Amino acid sequence: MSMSYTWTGALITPCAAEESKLPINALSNSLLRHHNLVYSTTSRSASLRQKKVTFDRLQVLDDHYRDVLKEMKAKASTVKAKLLSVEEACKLTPPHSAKSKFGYGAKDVRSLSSRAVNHIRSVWKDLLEDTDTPIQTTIMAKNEVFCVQPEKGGRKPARLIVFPDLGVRVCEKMALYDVVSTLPQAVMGSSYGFQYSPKQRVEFLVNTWKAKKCPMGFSYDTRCFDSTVTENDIRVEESIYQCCDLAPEARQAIRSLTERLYVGGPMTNSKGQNCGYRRCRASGVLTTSCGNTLTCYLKAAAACRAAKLQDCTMLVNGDDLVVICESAGTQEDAASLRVFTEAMTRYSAPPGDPPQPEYDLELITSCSSNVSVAHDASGKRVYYLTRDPTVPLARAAWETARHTPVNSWLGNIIMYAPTLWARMILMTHFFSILLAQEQLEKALDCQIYGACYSIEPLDLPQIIERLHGLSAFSLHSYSPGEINRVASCLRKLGVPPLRVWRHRARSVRAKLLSQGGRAAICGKYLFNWAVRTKLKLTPIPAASRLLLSGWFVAGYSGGDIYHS
Ligand SMILES: O=C(O)C(Cc1ccc(Oc2ccccc2Br)cc1)NC(=O)[C@]12C[C@H]3C[C@H](C[C@H](C3)C1)C2
Numbered sequence: 001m002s003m004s005y006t007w008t009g010a011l012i013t014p015c016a017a018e019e020s021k022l023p024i025n026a027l028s029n030s031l032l033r034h035h036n037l038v039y040s041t042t043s044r045s046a047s048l049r050q051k052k053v054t055f056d057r058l059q060v061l062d063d064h065y066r067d068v069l070k071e072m073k074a075k076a077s078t079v080k081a082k083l084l085s086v087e088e089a090c091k092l093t094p095p096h097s098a099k100s101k102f103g104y105g106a107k108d109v110r111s112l113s114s115r116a117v118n119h120i121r122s123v124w125k126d127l128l129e130d131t132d133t134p135i136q137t138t139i140m141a142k143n144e145v146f147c148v149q150p151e152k153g154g155r156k157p158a159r160l161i162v163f164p165d166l167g168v169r170v171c172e173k174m175a176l177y178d179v180v181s182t183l184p185q186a187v188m189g190s191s192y193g194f195q196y197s198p199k200q201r202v203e204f205l206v207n208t209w210k211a212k213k214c215p216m217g218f219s220y221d222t223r224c225f226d227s228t229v230t231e232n233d234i235r236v237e238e239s240i241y242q243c244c245d246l247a248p249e250a251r252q253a254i255r256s257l258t259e260r261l262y263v264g265g266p267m268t269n270s271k272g273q274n275c276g277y278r279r280c281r282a283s284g285v286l287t288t289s290c291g292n293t294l295t296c297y298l299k300a301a302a303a304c305r306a307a308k309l310q311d312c313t314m315l316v317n318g319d320d321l322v323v324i325c326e327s328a329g330t331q332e333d334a335a336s337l338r339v340f341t342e343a344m345t346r347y348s349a350p351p352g353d354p355p356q357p358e359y360d361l362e363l364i365t366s367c368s369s370n371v372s373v374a375h376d377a378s379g380k381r382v383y384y385l386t387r388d389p390t391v392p393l394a395r396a397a398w399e400t401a402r403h404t405p406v407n408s409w410l411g412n413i414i415m416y417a418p419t420l421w422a423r424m425i426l427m428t429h430f431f432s433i434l435l436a437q438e439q440l441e442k443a444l445d446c447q448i449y450g451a452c453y454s455i456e457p458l459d460l461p462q463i464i465e466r467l468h469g470l471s472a473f474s475l476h477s478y479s480p481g482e483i484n485r486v487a488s489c490l491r492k493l494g495v496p497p498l499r500v501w502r503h504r505a506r507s508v509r510a511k512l513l514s515q516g517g518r519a520a521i522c523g524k525y526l527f528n529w530a531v532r533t534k535l536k537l538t539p540i541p542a543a544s545r546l547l548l549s550g551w552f553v554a555g556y557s558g559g560d561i562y563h564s
């Protein structure tokens, strides 16, 4: 019986200028034409999200709960985590990270400047000596682009982001970075979804589905997960971390950061005004992904035991949960789900949209995607993940008409490379401009699982072949449903139908060819689909000579992480 937030009256303010509408770049229209369906959320709607996230939490724990928890601790107690030298942690800080309120900035932290490392050290020392005073935090409204869908009641309010000053953030890395990158995997084995690259996630889903006599799966959408995480949920997370073999110093920091940061604390807007008090999960700390995954898995697994799902498998990614089990008859299934929801609700994690049993894999949506099918060169059946490309496109359009620090279009191209909307529209549309500006060599930033990475377009082919396999360049005969969903979308937004992109693709693939080197290996593999005479595509050598290690290991959303 504790509120997720208390508010003072202070508005959530923006620090910069917030553009809500698409500018009208002549280039933007080379992609999307109905630029009035595209929109970005601003701190103008923050008060609506505030109502949504502010609620009371009732939570009753039980035997199933305690049994699973105990099993988790057991596995946790077999993990050993080290600390991180100020230096080591400083390197994990993104070049563009928010500057500290204490004189220095991101580059100063990255460049191990003196003033910075001195504050970072005073902060660390303060964590060891004071284990009670609530650390201060800032609450900003996020600004993400979407498309207008009248079927949902128009537009959606901006999401909130709550984070601590850069000093603290670098400490968090020193104390927990190694833990949140190892504890998760060790406690929930194969259920931990961040250990998989696209090719592996698909493989884990299909295999698990096909491994059931009469498969039955569902996705469980939790209404505002972060807001439901109770203080006991966070102290429980801590007790799990504490199971690891930690340095007496790392233990004091972890305990101190839990009591002072994670379990809640006060918030101020950009103007330094007292905004409110948080008593639920902070969206912008390092343990956000690890914490949500651990806690989402804990409750879910215990609910499976109250509902009696038969031989079930779970795949968790933060607050995103998908469950596949053995069917017990459509009616018994519907009922096992209602008890599942009832158990979850008791664990302080009610849902938004109530879960619904599904019997067709390709009709399940987890991590905003679904399995679909296509065929490789030798006409073999190949599975891959995809989604409605509306948002992806509406954003790929906004990022063409306004410069953005991190661009999703490159993340989508990588993660959804085998899809047809990514290959015929994204690759085509972008490698296009990266020629009308000669930037095939210029590295660009993008996020994956939260971690930030610097990637060069000219390396996409090797990368893709690594996450999706070589088939991803020769997939044909896509399922009609999919082909149709994309086409339907393109018509909605105003994006030239697939045929137009086929033409553009042949062209682009050309200027890229009559440019040889690497720009021609991209036009060769990334566009072998826009030419009748299809050249033979074989294993890329420079595809092995690349370690994508850090990539798919753990999740770091809101963790202010930068991988190099
Ligand atoms: O922010 C995150 O924490 C985050 C998590 C995430 C988890 C599981 C996924 O499983 C899938 C789902 C479909 C295909 C393959 C795989 Br493994 C995909 C993404 N998003 C991104 O990494 C992304 C990467 C790229 C593409 C999207 C949007 C932005 C840019 C954020 C997800």
Ligand SMILES: [Cl-]
Pocket (backbone or CB within 6 Å): 479, 480, 481, 482
């Ligand atoms: Cl179909």
